[PDB]
Nucleic acid binder design. Structure first.
Length: 682
RNA sequence: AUUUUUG
């Protein structure tokens, strides 16, 4: 079964996620909405949690700011989105297609809401105060304008088809009648800062009640009759739990609300640092609340929570899903207030994937949001067991490499040229090399030390073209540019080539360097004596990989796959040149194998540890291709990404499973057997 | 208030 590590739920949106009974959850993320099946219908083992990422609403060209399902029986498949691209779209989630849309707003849309009473009414609000009422299924629209203020949220009454509550940036809360040109029926005064959330009481009559949540740290309950406040709940200041959190990153309160139709005398809200509270409205003056996951530790959110969406499953479980700045989507069991499960998300390109050969299945992911992920992919009760590492990172993690033998030892490299060393078994900050790369760290590799270094050294390749040799025990010490050793050993006069890739042979006897001009150079230990130059690519080399040493034939370990900014992949066999061990280098100009098919640059190639000469490649053409390299046969093509692939890694235990990562902020785990397409698009 | 003209 495939898996998806999706883009992070968007931040600072009053309503950018929702859920329908059954059930289905949708959350805005970047330019799309992701769909997640929850409950019995997810078809999961009694061990693992019952959810699956099943869909994507694709079409917006800019940030999705709002999302809302229809909650009319028989039309749960319909939903609406707003976007910074200026449009409001109506979607059918069954087909994942646009039913109809409008571009009536001329200013940045703030939010929108599907009317609970009128089947085809979608009400949206923008930054200038303009409200549009949209009856999509009769082609109708009405503009309303109340106050010249920035709308933060709005919520149609669940009881009265004409009444809509609007909350503004300055704290104004109004209840308007859209049949009366938007006339203000109630002007609710009391809040001193942004309204983040408006929830109507699910029960009519006291009239009706409604609750507003504000950045001013108050939740206010109002009487819809007497147009005045009848209850003020102030958030409790609580001791920070769980997350050892980066203090510097700025973050103020987001106070969102959930008023359960299940239990009208309870009210759920967010709190400082992403805690969730269940308020007891009967004990108003005592300000009684119960903390979510107050018993368990490390289960609560670590940063502010933006959206809360109730979901009753068909086996009558009362769930509540929470989105958060901490990039976890959490599912809460209302009956127990415990976190049933957590779905991690990515806030940047997935630049890098590396499987530990020490802890099988431990998959490190280098992400553009400055956090290293470690996914225990073989966790039994959890398909998304992921730990985050943020200390000493900050920038985009563009390169990763596990140590060959030492548990928890993970090298990483960043977009600002930094090279660091993590002990993921600890929570101590990483050691950072004192020597920086001028540009992005594109590759990291462990290998035998070479002079003047004084059992394995760390090699790093940066975008400026230098390969550094670091002493993992002396990271604060100096790192050596191996170009000096190359130069001396090979007596070179002219300027050395710009190195763009480094890859050590599995035995650690041979080092291959890819260069910017397309050439690949083959050096042998201990002095990096050049024994061979390969001239095949004529653009920058992005990736090089040596076949493993446990195939049916030992000779296979001399197979070397390579990808560059051209779409064609080559395989070279260095048995002859390496065994002959020449005193002057050989120039190779003919490929041992030639793999054609992709239509864009190659970012990563990897050999299956389960087969002989089986290669997977990742390309900017948006696909990962699995080849029988020996036969030059294109076996299967994965097209699940919507962006350009940046990395790929074979599962260590499952010959059918591969992981890939792209600039769509997604990591996919997919099955070669579920892939019917044989080759890239042509 | 993160969401990359960027291997």
């Amino acid at each position: 079964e495939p898996r998806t590590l999706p883009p992070s739920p968007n931040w600072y949106c009053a309503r950018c996620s929702d859920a329908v009974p059954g059930g289905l959850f949708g959350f805005a993320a970047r330019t799309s909405v992701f769909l997640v099946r929850v409950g019995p219908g997810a078809g999961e083992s009694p061990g693992t949690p019952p959810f699956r990422v099943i869909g994507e609403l694709v079409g917006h060209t800019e940030r999705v700011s709002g999302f809302t399902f229809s909650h009319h029986p028989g039309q749960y498949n319909l939903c609406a989105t707003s976007s910074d691209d200026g449009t409001v779209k109506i979607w059918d989630v069954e087909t994942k297609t646009v039913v109809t849309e409008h571009a009536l707003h001329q200013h940045t849309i703030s939010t929108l809401h599907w009317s609970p009473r009128v089947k085809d009414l979608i009400v949206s609000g923008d930054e200038k105060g303009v409200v549009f009422c949209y009856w999509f299924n009769r082609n109708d629209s009405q503009h309303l304008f109340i106050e010249p203020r920035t709308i933060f949220c709005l919520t149609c009454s669940p009881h009265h088809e004409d009444l809509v509550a609007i909350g503004y940036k300055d704290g104004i809360v109004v209840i308007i009648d859209i049949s009366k040109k938007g006339e203000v029926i109630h002007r609710l005064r009391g809040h001193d800062d942004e309204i983040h959330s408006i929830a109507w009481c699910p029960l009519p009559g006291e009239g009706c009640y409604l609750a507003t949540g504000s950045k001013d740290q108050t939740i206010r309950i109002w009487s819809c009759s007497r147009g005045r406040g009848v209850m003020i709940l102030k958030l409790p200041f609580l001791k920070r739990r769980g997350g050892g959190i980066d203090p510097t990153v700025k973050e103020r309160l987001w106070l969102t609300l959930h008023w359960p139709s299940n239990q009208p005398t309870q009210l759920v809200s967010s709190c400082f640092g992403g805690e969730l509270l269940q308020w007891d409205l009967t004990q108003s003056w005592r300000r009684k609340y119960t903390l979510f996951s107050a018993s368990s530790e490390g289960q609560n959110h670590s940063r502010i929570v933006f959206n809360l969406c109730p979901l009753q499953t068909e086996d009558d479980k009362q769930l509540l899903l929470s989105t958060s700045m901490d990039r976890d989507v959490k599912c809460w069991d209302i009956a127990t207030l415990e976190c049933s499960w957590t779905l991690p998300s990515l806030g940047g390109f997935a630049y890098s994937l590396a499987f530990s050969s020490v802890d099988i299945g431990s998959l490190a992911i280098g992400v553009g949001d400055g956090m290293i992920r470690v996914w225990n992919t073989l966790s039994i009760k959890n398909n998304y067991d992921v730990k985050n590492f943020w200390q000493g990172v900050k920038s985009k993690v563009t390169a990763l490499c596990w140590h060959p033998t030492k548990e928890g030892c993970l090298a990483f490299g960043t977009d600002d040229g930094k090279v660091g060393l993590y002990d993921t078994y600890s929570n101590k900050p990483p050691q950072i090399s004192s020597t920086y790369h001028k540009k992005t760290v594109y590759t990291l590799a462990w290998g035998p030390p070479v002079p003047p270094m004084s059992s394995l050294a760390l090699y790093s390749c940066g975008g400026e073209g230098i390969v550094l040799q670091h002493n993992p025990w002396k990271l604060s010490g100096e790192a050596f540019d191996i170009n000096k050793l190359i130069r001396d050993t090979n007596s070179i006069k002219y300027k050395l080539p710009v190195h763009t890739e480094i890859s050590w042979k599995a035995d650690g006897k041979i080092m291959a360097l890819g260069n910017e001009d397309g050439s690949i150079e083959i050096f042998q230990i201990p002095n990096l004596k050049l024994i061979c130059t390969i001239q095949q690519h004529h653009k920058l080399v992005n990736t090089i990989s040596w076949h493993h040493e446990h195939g049916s034939q030992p000779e296979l370990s001399y197979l070397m796959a390579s990808g560059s900014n051209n779409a064609v992949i080559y395989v070279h066999n260095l048995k002859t040149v390496i065994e002959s061990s020449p005193e002057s280098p050989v120039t190779i100009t003919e490929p041992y194998r030639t793999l054609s098919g992709h239509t864009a640059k190659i970012t990563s190639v990897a050999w299956s540890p389960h087969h002989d000469g089986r290669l997977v490649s990742a390309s900017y053409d948006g696909t990962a291709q699995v080849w029988d390299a020996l036969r030059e046969e294109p076996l299967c093509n994965f097209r699940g990404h919507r962006g350009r692939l940046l990395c790929v890694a074979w599962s260590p235990l499952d010959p059918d499973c591969i992981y890939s990562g792209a600039d769509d902020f997604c990591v996919h785990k997919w099955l070669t057997s579920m892939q019917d397409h044989s080759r890239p698009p042509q």
